[PDB]
Tab-separated table of C-alpha atoms and ligand atoms in Angstrom:
chain	number	residue	atom	x	y	z
K	1	UNK	CA	16.748	2.143	22.046
K	2	UNK	CA	16.482	5.565	20.311
K	3	UNK	CA	15.442	6.396	16.727
K	4	UNK	CA	17.030	9.274	14.792
K	5	UNK	CA	15.743	12.694	15.814
K	6	UNK	CA	14.400	13.441	12.316
K	7	UNK	CA	12.674	10.067	11.820
K	8	UNK	CA	9.271	10.272	10.153
K	9	UNK	CA	6.404	8.967	12.320
K	10	UNK	CA	3.040	8.675	10.614
K	11	UNK	CA	-0.138	6.809	9.906
K	12	UNK	CA	-1.559	5.889	6.534
K	13	UNK	CA	-4.877	5.730	4.683
K	14	UNK	CA	-6.137	5.423	1.100
K	15	UNK	CA	-8.814	7.511	-0.579
K	16	UNK	CA	-11.473	4.930	-1.420
K	17	UNK	CA	-11.096	3.302	2.010
K	18	UNK	CA	-11.898	6.513	3.938
K	19	UNK	CA	-13.311	9.399	1.885
K	20	UNK	CA	-16.881	8.588	1.003
K	21	UNK	CA	-18.571	11.409	-0.919
K	22	UNK	CA	-18.388	9.210	-3.981
K	23	UNK	CA	-20.554	11.439	-6.202
K	24	UNK	CA	-19.587	14.829	-4.817
K	25	UNK	CA	-17.768	17.654	-6.524
K	26	UNK	CA	-17.547	15.979	-9.910
K	27	UNK	CA	-15.992	12.656	-8.873
K	28	UNK	CA	-16.219	9.978	-11.515
K	29	UNK	CA	-16.803	6.251	-11.121
K	30	UNK	CA	-13.880	4.010	-10.118
K	31	UNK	CA	-13.483	0.277	-10.531
K	32	UNK	CA	-14.059	-0.045	-6.772
K	33	UNK	CA	-17.428	1.716	-6.997
K	34	UNK	CA	-18.425	-0.792	-9.671
K	35	UNK	CA	-16.993	-3.751	-7.788
K	36	UNK	CA	-18.409	-2.932	-4.365
K	37	UNK	CA	-21.871	-2.405	-5.873
K	38	UNK	CA	-21.731	-5.845	-7.521
K	39	UNK	CA	-23.723	-8.391	-5.472
K	40	UNK	CA	-21.588	-10.805	-3.488
K	41	UNK	CA	-18.151	-9.223	-3.987
K	42	UNK	CA	-17.853	-7.614	-0.516
K	43	UNK	CA	-18.065	-9.953	2.466
K	44	UNK	CA	-20.543	-7.878	4.508
K	45	UNK	CA	-22.603	-6.094	1.886
K	46	UNK	CA	-20.937	-2.701	2.464
K	47	UNK	CA	-19.415	-0.225	0.014
K	48	UNK	CA	-17.150	2.809	0.158
K	49	UNK	CA	-20.065	5.181	-0.506
K	50	UNK	CA	-19.690	6.765	2.947
K	51	UNK	CA	-16.763	4.925	4.587
K	52	UNK	CA	-15.285	7.306	7.181
K	53	UNK	CA	-16.661	10.412	5.434
K	54	UNK	CA	-13.114	11.804	5.423
K	55	UNK	CA	-13.842	13.921	2.351
K	56	UNK	CA	-15.854	16.082	4.758
K	57	UNK	CA	-14.204	15.098	8.032
K	58	UNK	CA	-10.503	15.349	7.199
K	59	UNK	CA	-10.259	18.003	9.911
K	60	UNK	CA	-11.135	15.379	12.495
K	61	UNK	CA	-8.501	13.079	10.980
K	62	UNK	CA	-5.935	15.868	11.367
K	63	UNK	CA	-7.020	16.271	14.990
K	64	UNK	CA	-6.278	12.589	15.565
K	65	UNK	CA	-2.851	12.800	13.947
K	66	UNK	CA	-2.054	15.797	16.161
K	67	UNK	CA	-3.322	14.022	19.277
K	68	UNK	CA	-1.017	11.098	18.472
K	69	UNK	CA	1.993	13.413	18.012
K	70	UNK	CA	2.741	12.171	14.511
K	71	UNK	CA	4.777	14.290	12.110
K	72	UNK	CA	3.555	12.877	8.777
K	73	UNK	CA	0.428	11.546	7.083
K	74	UNK	CA	0.414	9.105	4.185
K	75	UNK	CA	-2.758	9.366	2.110
K	76	UNK	CA	-3.774	8.914	-1.496
K	77	UNK	CA	-5.302	11.164	-4.129
K	78	UNK	CA	-8.344	9.769	-5.914
K	79	UNK	CA	-7.750	9.811	-9.667
K	80	UNK	CA	-11.562	9.845	-10.223
K	81	UNK	CA	-11.728	13.235	-8.479
K	82	UNK	CA	-8.951	14.732	-10.609
K	83	UNK	CA	-9.661	13.297	-14.085
K	84	UNK	CA	-13.179	11.853	-13.837
K	85	UNK	CA	-13.065	10.331	-17.330
K	86	UNK	CA	-9.618	8.851	-16.676
K	87	UNK	CA	-8.215	10.532	-19.746
K	88	UNK	CA	-9.807	13.875	-20.407
K	89	UNK	CA	-10.182	17.279	-18.827
K	90	UNK	CA	-9.209	17.962	-15.271
K	91	UNK	CA	-11.762	18.580	-12.533
K	92	UNK	CA	-10.378	21.703	-10.856
K	93	UNK	CA	-12.767	21.224	-7.915
K	94	UNK	CA	-10.996	17.947	-7.112
K	95	UNK	CA	-7.573	19.549	-7.161
K	96	UNK	CA	-8.790	22.433	-4.999
K	97	UNK	CA	-10.036	19.989	-2.363
K	98	UNK	CA	-6.657	18.308	-1.996
K	99	UNK	CA	-4.908	21.676	-2.095
K	100	UNK	CA	-6.943	22.830	0.946
K	101	UNK	CA	-6.302	19.512	2.698
K	102	UNK	CA	-2.540	19.833	2.125
K	103	UNK	CA	-2.596	23.365	3.534
K	104	UNK	CA	-4.502	22.116	6.593
K	105	UNK	CA	-1.899	19.374	7.115
K	106	UNK	CA	1.033	21.748	6.779
K	107	UNK	CA	-0.669	24.191	9.134
K	108	UNK	CA	-0.783	21.398	11.714
K	109	UNK	CA	2.873	20.498	11.281
K	110	UNK	CA	2.223	17.263	9.385
K	111	UNK	CA	4.296	16.389	6.328
K	112	UNK	CA	2.125	14.962	3.503
K	113	UNK	CA	3.361	11.716	1.916
K	114	UNK	CA	1.123	11.344	-1.118
K	115	UNK	CA	0.282	8.173	-3.032
K	116	UNK	CA	-0.959	8.870	-6.567
K	117	UNK	CA	-2.516	5.433	-7.234
K	118	UNK	CA	-4.068	3.399	-4.441
K	119	UNK	CA	-6.239	1.151	-6.587
K	120	UNK	CA	-9.108	3.419	-7.656
K	121	UNK	CA	-8.708	3.287	-11.430
K	122	UNK	CA	-11.363	5.319	-13.292
K	123	UNK	CA	-13.972	2.972	-14.696
K	124	UNK	CA	-13.817	4.483	-18.220
K	125	UNK	CA	-10.244	3.272	-18.457
K	126	UNK	CA	-11.202	-0.243	-17.338
K	127	UNK	CA	-13.869	-0.198	-20.074
K	128	UNK	CA	-10.878	0.098	-22.453
K	129	UNK	CA	-9.052	-2.834	-20.781
K	130	UNK	CA	-7.649	-0.924	-17.796
K	131	UNK	CA	-4.178	-2.053	-16.824
K	132	UNK	CA	-4.377	-4.588	-19.653
K	133	UNK	CA	-3.730	-1.676	-22.041
K	134	UNK	CA	-0.496	0.300	-22.511
K	135	UNK	CA	-2.603	3.419	-23.039
K	136	UNK	CA	-3.524	3.378	-19.355
K	137	UNK	CA	0.160	3.749	-18.481
K	138	UNK	CA	0.415	6.849	-20.651
K	139	UNK	CA	-2.649	8.508	-19.160
K	140	UNK	CA	-1.503	7.657	-15.624
K	141	UNK	CA	1.614	9.693	-16.332
K	142	UNK	CA	-0.573	12.583	-17.543
K	143	UNK	CA	-2.541	12.449	-14.264
K	144	UNK	CA	0.707	12.464	-12.269
K	145	UNK	CA	1.881	15.570	-14.159
K	146	UNK	CA	-1.380	17.429	-13.418
K	147	UNK	CA	-1.275	16.715	-9.695
K	148	UNK	CA	2.394	17.604	-9.241
K	149	UNK	CA	1.957	20.904	-11.088
K	150	UNK	CA	-0.623	22.006	-8.550
K	151	UNK	CA	0.591	20.432	-5.286
K	152	UNK	CA	4.343	20.012	-5.871
K	153	UNK	CA	5.105	23.445	-4.448
K	154	UNK	CA	4.164	22.052	-1.033
K	155	UNK	CA	4.476	18.248	-1.276
K	156	UNK	CA	7.984	16.877	-1.745
K	157	UNK	CA	7.411	13.165	-1.046
K	158	UNK	CA	5.373	11.270	-3.611
K	159	UNK	CA	4.758	7.627	-4.405
K	160	UNK	CA	3.445	6.570	-7.800
K	161	UNK	CA	1.797	3.230	-7.024
K	162	UNK	CA	0.748	1.332	-3.923
K	163	UNK	CA	1.241	-2.445	-4.119
K	164	UNK	CA	1.133	-3.200	-7.837
K	165	UNK	CA	1.226	-6.940	-7.089
K	166	UNK	CA	-2.240	-6.606	-5.558
K	167	UNK	CA	-3.669	-4.498	-8.372
K	168	UNK	CA	-2.387	-6.935	-10.998
K	169	UNK	CA	-2.734	-10.312	-9.314
K	170	UNK	CA	-5.747	-9.830	-7.053
K	171	UNK	CA	-7.538	-7.616	-9.540
K	172	UNK	CA	-6.890	-9.371	-12.841
K	173	UNK	CA	-5.810	-12.959	-12.042
K	174	UNK	CA	-7.446	-14.104	-8.779
K	175	UNK	CA	-10.537	-11.905	-9.192
K	176	UNK	CA	-10.903	-11.009	-5.510
K	177	UNK	CA	-10.228	-7.274	-5.952
K	178	UNK	CA	-11.528	-4.837	-8.529
K	179	UNK	CA	-11.987	-5.117	-11.429
K	180	UNK	CA	-12.333	-8.838	-10.705
K	181	UNK	CA	-10.937	-10.640	-13.758
K	182	UNK	CA	-9.562	-14.172	-13.562
K	183	UNK	CA	-6.898	-14.549	-16.243
K	184	UNK	CA	-3.211	-15.116	-15.587
K	185	UNK	CA	-2.075	-13.550	-18.862
K	186	UNK	CA	-4.074	-10.415	-18.158
K	187	UNK	CA	-2.657	-10.259	-14.640
K	188	UNK	CA	0.914	-10.428	-15.926
K	189	UNK	CA	0.184	-7.881	-18.642
K	190	UNK	CA	-1.300	-5.611	-15.981
K	191	UNK	CA	1.857	-5.982	-13.871
K	192	UNK	CA	3.920	-4.766	-16.809
K	193	UNK	CA	1.667	-1.794	-17.603
K	194	UNK	CA	1.605	-0.791	-13.933
K	195	UNK	CA	5.400	-0.766	-13.889
K	196	UNK	CA	5.508	1.116	-17.186
K	197	UNK	CA	3.013	3.645	-15.847
K	198	UNK	CA	5.210	4.095	-12.804
K	199	UNK	CA	8.282	4.747	-14.954
K	200	UNK	CA	6.515	7.160	-17.282
K	201	UNK	CA	5.036	8.994	-14.285
K	202	UNK	CA	8.421	9.440	-12.597
K	203	UNK	CA	9.769	11.185	-15.699
K	204	UNK	CA	6.656	13.296	-16.145
K	205	UNK	CA	6.676	14.308	-12.490
K	206	UNK	CA	10.294	15.466	-12.556
K	207	UNK	CA	9.604	17.595	-15.640
K	208	UNK	CA	6.436	19.130	-14.149
K	209	UNK	CA	7.681	19.727	-10.619
K	210	UNK	CA	8.192	23.306	-9.385
K	211	UNK	CA	10.936	22.069	-7.039
K	212	UNK	CA	13.009	18.909	-6.620
K	213	UNK	CA	10.835	15.986	-5.553
K	214	UNK	CA	11.550	12.787	-3.640
K	215	UNK	CA	9.741	10.117	-5.648
K	216	UNK	CA	9.237	6.490	-4.657
K	217	UNK	CA	7.023	3.482	-5.156
K	218	UNK	CA	5.378	1.351	-2.447
K	219	UNK	CA	5.675	-2.432	-2.600
K	220	UNK	CA	4.270	-5.166	-0.404
K	221	UNK	CA	7.104	-7.596	0.276
K	222	UNK	CA	6.726	-11.015	1.848
K	223	UNK	CA	9.903	-12.698	3.119
K	224	UNK	CA	9.699	-16.337	2.151
K	225	UNK	CA	11.218	-19.332	3.921
K	226	UNK	CA	11.195	-22.991	2.853
K	227	UNK	CA	9.508	-25.352	5.261
K	228	UNK	CA	12.387	-27.825	4.853
K	229	UNK	CA	15.687	-27.955	2.990
K	230	UNK	CA	14.411	-30.419	0.428
K	231	UNK	CA	14.979	-29.382	-3.194
K	232	UNK	CA	11.219	-29.294	-3.693
K	233	UNK	CA	10.496	-26.950	-0.776
K	234	UNK	CA	13.457	-24.676	-1.488
K	235	UNK	CA	12.334	-24.394	-5.099
K	236	UNK	CA	8.784	-23.600	-3.955
K	237	UNK	CA	10.126	-20.819	-1.730
K	238	UNK	CA	12.125	-19.381	-4.637
K	239	UNK	CA	9.056	-19.476	-6.894
K	240	UNK	CA	6.895	-17.701	-4.335
K	241	UNK	CA	9.648	-15.140	-3.703
K	242	UNK	CA	9.798	-14.558	-7.455
K	243	UNK	CA	6.006	-14.308	-7.807
K	244	UNK	CA	5.561	-11.610	-5.122
K	245	UNK	CA	8.904	-9.898	-4.573
K	246	UNK	CA	11.463	-10.274	-7.362
K	247	UNK	CA	8.959	-9.810	-10.213
K	248	UNK	CA	8.713	-6.155	-9.124
K	249	UNK	CA	12.054	-5.482	-7.442
K	250	UNK	CA	14.254	-6.693	-10.301
K	251	UNK	CA	12.806	-4.559	-13.132
K	252	UNK	CA	12.793	-1.501	-10.886
K	253	UNK	CA	16.475	-2.147	-10.143
K	254	UNK	CA	17.358	-2.311	-13.833
K	255	UNK	CA	17.790	-6.115	-13.859
K	256	UNK	CA	14.864	-7.019	-16.127
K	257	UNK	CA	12.285	-9.529	-15.131
K	258	UNK	CA	13.700	-12.545	-13.251
K	259	UNK	CA	14.595	-15.263	-15.747
K	260	UNK	CA	13.432	-18.114	-13.502
K	261	UNK	CA	9.958	-16.600	-13.420
K	262	UNK	CA	9.882	-15.913	-17.144
K	263	UNK	CA	10.678	-19.595	-17.699
K	264	UNK	CA	8.010	-20.649	-15.210
K	265	UNK	CA	5.326	-18.432	-16.742
K	266	UNK	CA	6.299	-19.363	-20.306
K	267	UNK	CA	3.813	-18.148	-22.889
K	268	UNK	CA	1.822	-16.176	-20.314
K	269	UNK	CA	4.735	-13.831	-19.636
K	270	UNK	CA	4.377	-10.296	-21.028
K	271	UNK	CA	6.234	-9.066	-24.106
K	272	UNK	CA	8.844	-6.830	-22.468
K	273	UNK	CA	10.872	-5.038	-25.092
K	274	UNK	CA	14.013	-3.330	-23.763
K	275	UNK	CA	12.697	0.203	-24.239
K	276	UNK	CA	10.013	-0.530	-21.636
K	277	UNK	CA	12.509	-1.963	-19.138
K	278	UNK	CA	14.693	1.122	-19.372
K	279	UNK	CA	11.686	3.322	-18.584
K	280	UNK	CA	10.589	1.095	-15.680
K	281	UNK	CA	14.031	1.502	-14.084
K	282	UNK	CA	13.788	5.295	-13.794
K	283	UNK	CA	15.866	6.344	-10.762
K	284	UNK	CA	13.959	6.631	-7.496
K	285	UNK	CA	14.640	8.696	-4.422
K	286	UNK	CA	13.241	6.162	-1.937
K	287	UNK	CA	11.395	2.860	-1.682
K	288	UNK	CA	8.383	2.199	0.519
K	289	UNK	CA	7.967	-1.213	2.112
K	290	UNK	CA	4.594	-2.464	3.243
K	291	UNK	CA	5.178	-5.319	5.691
K	292	UNK	CA	2.564	-7.600	7.238
K	293	UNK	CA	3.558	-11.258	7.077
K	294	UNK	CA	5.973	-13.962	6.018
K	295	UNK	CA	5.393	-17.004	3.842
K	296	UNK	CA	6.640	-20.382	5.076
K	297	UNK	CA	6.381	-22.345	1.830
K	298	UNK	CA	5.879	-26.022	1.076
K	299	UNK	CA	5.846	-27.436	-2.451
K	300	UNK	CA	2.281	-27.969	-3.696
K	301	UNK	CA	2.511	-29.303	-7.265
K	302	UNK	CA	-1.214	-30.020	-7.584
K	303	UNK	CA	-2.069	-26.547	-6.293
K	304	UNK	CA	-2.455	-23.480	-8.497
K	305	UNK	CA	0.415	-21.213	-9.443
K	306	UNK	CA	3.044	-20.708	-8.038
K	307	UNK	CA	2.492	-24.216	-6.639
K	308	UNK	CA	3.542	-23.230	-3.129
K	309	UNK	CA	1.262	-23.370	-0.144
K	310	UNK	CA	1.570	-21.757	3.233
K	311	UNK	CA	2.474	-23.911	6.220
K	312	UNK	CA	0.743	-22.314	9.183
K	313	UNK	CA	2.552	-22.215	12.518
K	314	UNK	CA	-0.083	-22.586	15.265
K	315	UNK	CA	2.471	-21.565	17.908
K	316	UNK	CA	2.850	-18.019	16.550
K	317	UNK	CA	0.400	-15.210	17.362
K	318	UNK	CA	-2.432	-14.673	14.901
K	319	UNK	CA	-4.568	-11.600	14.339
K	320	UNK	CA	-8.078	-11.522	12.870
K	321	UNK	CA	-6.628	-12.257	9.426
K	322	UNK	CA	-2.846	-12.915	9.527
K	323	UNK	CA	0.071	-14.691	11.165
K	324	UNK	CA	2.451	-12.436	13.108
K	325	UNK	CA	6.193	-12.753	12.397
K	326	UNK	CA	8.109	-9.609	13.356
K	327	UNK	CA	11.555	-10.955	12.522
K	328	UNK	CA	10.589	-11.059	8.850
K	329	UNK	CA	10.730	-7.260	8.841
K	330	UNK	CA	14.390	-7.346	9.819
K	331	UNK	CA	15.088	-10.048	7.249
K	332	UNK	CA	13.476	-8.233	4.325
K	333	UNK	CA	15.110	-4.912	5.206
K	334	UNK	CA	18.547	-6.479	5.410
K	335	UNK	CA	17.970	-8.184	2.064
K	336	UNK	CA	16.994	-4.875	0.441
K	337	UNK	CA	19.949	-3.059	1.977
K	338	UNK	CA	22.494	-5.666	0.912
K	339	UNK	CA	21.120	-6.936	-2.392
K	340	UNK	CA	19.259	-4.051	-4.060
K	341	UNK	CA	20.130	-0.430	-4.866
K	342	UNK	CA	17.139	1.396	-3.330
K	343	UNK	CA	17.773	3.826	-0.483
K	344	UNK	CA	16.607	5.352	1.732
K	345	UNK	CA	13.741	3.123	2.811
K	346	UNK	CA	10.456	3.891	4.551
K	347	UNK	CA	8.033	1.456	6.150
K	348	UNK	CA	4.916	2.803	4.472
K	349	UNK	CA	2.485	0.331	6.090
K	350	UNK	CA	2.592	-2.017	9.068
K	351	UNK	CA	-0.395	-2.891	11.224
K	352	UNK	CA	-2.944	-5.471	12.186
K	353	UNK	CA	-6.633	-6.234	12.316
K	354	UNK	CA	-8.449	-7.386	15.435
K	355	UNK	CA	-12.010	-7.856	16.629
K	356	UNK	CA	-11.979	-4.521	18.405
K	357	UNK	CA	-14.879	-3.341	20.533
K	358	UNK	CA	-15.565	-0.394	22.819
K	359	UNK	CA	-15.367	-1.558	26.426
K	360	UNK	CA	-17.566	-0.379	29.293
K	361	UNK	CA	-15.035	2.328	30.212
K	362	UNK	CA	-15.148	3.799	26.690
K	363	UNK	CA	-11.675	2.682	25.609
K	364	UNK	CA	-10.603	0.008	23.148
K	365	UNK	CA	-8.263	-2.429	24.890
K	366	UNK	CA	-6.315	-3.713	21.888
K	367	UNK	CA	-3.319	-5.207	23.661
K	368	UNK	CA	-2.406	-7.466	20.736
K	369	UNK	CA	-2.046	-4.401	18.503
K	370	UNK	CA	0.168	-2.682	21.040
K	371	UNK	CA	2.315	-5.826	21.179
K	372	UNK	CA	2.363	-5.970	17.374
K	373	UNK	CA	3.764	-2.442	17.137
K	374	UNK	CA	6.271	-2.940	19.948
K	375	UNK	CA	7.656	-6.093	18.356
K	376	UNK	CA	7.983	-4.604	14.864
K	377	UNK	CA	9.558	-1.383	16.117
K	378	UNK	CA	12.192	-3.457	17.953
K	379	UNK	CA	13.102	-5.093	14.647
K	380	UNK	CA	13.511	-1.683	13.044
K	381	UNK	CA	16.063	-0.764	15.721
K	382	UNK	CA	17.961	-3.945	14.880
K	383	UNK	CA	17.871	-3.028	11.189
K	384	UNK	CA	19.121	0.499	11.887
K	385	UNK	CA	21.988	-0.938	13.958
K	386	UNK	CA	22.998	-3.041	10.922
K	387	UNK	CA	23.210	0.110	8.812
K	388	UNK	CA	19.881	-0.088	6.926
K	389	UNK	CA	19.031	3.504	5.808
K	390	UNK	CA	15.518	3.612	7.227
K	391	UNK	CA	13.939	7.051	7.460
K	392	UNK	CA	10.382	6.566	8.692
K	393	UNK	CA	7.512	4.369	9.785
K	394	UNK	CA	3.800	4.630	8.997
K	395	UNK	CA	1.215	2.610	10.869
K	396	UNK	CA	-1.618	1.135	8.848
K	397	UNK	CA	-4.171	2.562	9.464
K	398	UNK	CA	-5.007	5.879	11.091
K	399	UNK	CA	-8.601	4.694	11.524
K	400	UNK	CA	-10.821	1.702	10.884
K	401	UNK	CA	-12.000	1.902	7.300
K	402	UNK	CA	-13.380	0.058	4.253
K	403	UNK	CA	-11.017	-2.918	3.999
K	404	UNK	CA	-11.612	-3.772	0.356
K	405	UNK	CA	-13.286	-7.156	-0.146
K	406	UNK	CA	-13.729	-7.539	3.622
K	407	UNK	CA	-15.768	-4.354	3.810
K	408	UNK	CA	-16.192	-2.574	7.123
K	409	UNK	CA	-15.790	-5.849	9.042
K	410	UNK	CA	-11.980	-5.887	9.341
K	411	UNK	CA	-10.638	-3.166	11.664
K	412	UNK	CA	-7.002	-2.104	11.106
K	413	UNK	CA	-7.123	1.316	12.754
K	414	UNK	CA	-5.158	2.707	15.644
K	415	UNK	CA	-8.344	4.767	16.051
K	416	UNK	CA	-11.764	3.124	16.189
K	417	UNK	CA	-14.412	4.319	13.734
K	418	UNK	CA	-18.086	4.056	14.628
K	419	UNK	CA	-19.477	3.617	11.109
K	420	UNK	CA	-23.006	4.624	12.131
K	421	UNK	CA	-22.122	7.958	13.808
K	422	UNK	CA	-18.687	8.523	12.218
K	423	UNK	CA	-17.154	9.239	15.624
K	424	UNK	CA	-13.489	8.329	15.965
K	425	UNK	CA	-11.851	7.279	19.218
K	426	UNK	CA	-8.182	6.496	19.903
K	427	UNK	CA	-7.488	2.852	20.783
K	428	UNK	CA	-5.109	1.912	23.586
K	429	UNK	CA	-2.454	1.025	21.007
K	430	UNK	CA	-2.732	4.560	19.621
K	431	UNK	CA	-2.001	5.982	23.058
K	432	UNK	CA	0.968	3.626	23.321
K	433	UNK	CA	2.332	4.912	19.989
K	434	UNK	CA	1.739	8.499	21.090
K	435	UNK	CA	3.724	7.972	24.267
K	436	UNK	CA	6.492	5.988	22.538
K	437	UNK	CA	6.965	8.697	19.893
K	438	UNK	CA	6.957	11.419	22.546
K	439	UNK	CA	9.765	9.596	24.347
K	440	UNK	CA	11.769	9.653	21.109
N	1	LIG	O1	-5.090	-5.452	4.134
N	1	LIG	C1	-4.473	-4.339	4.776
N	1	LIG	C2	-3.885	-3.296	3.838
N	1	LIG	O2	-3.045	-4.008	2.941
N	1	LIG	C3	-2.210	-3.152	2.177
N	1	LIG	O3	-1.844	-4.117	1.256
N	1	LIG	C4	-3.059	-2.136	1.382
N	1	LIG	O4	-2.198	-1.074	0.920
N	1	LIG	C5	-4.089	-1.479	2.303
N	1	LIG	O5	-4.968	-0.682	1.489
N	1	LIG	C6	-4.892	-2.625	2.916
N	1	LIG	O6	-5.924	-2.069	3.707
């Protein structure tokens, strides 16, 4: 029934999804500025130019966090505000902005959990191949050093990357996210340079920090289940598990890349010399899990890689964009606890999108989202009872925002954002979380 007294309770955002102010105070161009301004890439014709205007309205965001009784806020720093050319001089005005924001959070009793990279690569670096180039890993580590030197007196909890599988595979192989390339080899090379950037940044951050830091990385993990026990379906489930989960977990754990996936990828696999793998496995203080969905896999040999397709279950609840499977959160946490070395663990994102509207009474009656949270929180209690060292939970998202290729049309907030007036309003699920946390 009861969570630990010192459990972290938060909500999460990312800079490009909320900030707006894309040209203000020296900000450079990111790959997502380029991509969202390319005709046809965003489903509803919107961009992040304004978004939630949180660059100016972060005080309102803090008011919401306080109204919800949270004790932490997960947000990202925009690399284009700090080093507008990607590699080059710093923009002190960008650092000063986040320094003021951090002081405002600490003044309100909210612990900042900062993500350094949440997908907004400076465009000048993409012009030089972006994550397809090892040089980008080096300059990412330089950016991490700069930020820690100025904010690390107040921020202890840092993550290097958010969801490298998305940046690599959606951005460079499937072409649905920025920068929008469609080449498997480039996607796998990007996955390696992301991991190398992470490892180089961890070392740089520890050397630059004015106090001991707690450094992690944030991964999306998808528990995978075969649709049947046939050799074909079990193999498809292992391939999908390797493609999303083990490709990242194993090198971070010091186990190299998974051999079964190297064999499957063949000539497309990156050249991973052992020096790189040692750097990638730099010791971490925590691991962040982003959990949304499971994969029930059936073999699909004529499909594209990894030749596994999803078998939908019409009996389970569905949101605006996903299938709901709360028990997968327990499963993946138990797997991490038993099979991998990372601890403690945080749930750095969990949430859902619905077709929310303001009702006649002025509230947002998002009962499915309340049920979503209740069901996932129950699974966390089960995981804690099994001994999983879980230390906090962050709802995605604090407020409705720019949901990447879906634009403003996919609402994940616990607070509703009116994108015309920029007013925020707490949804019923947000009041449920407030009252649940208060009872803890
Ligand atoms: O699609 C919902 C969320 O998915 C997570 O993978 C990303 O970190 C968020 O930025 C995104 O909004």
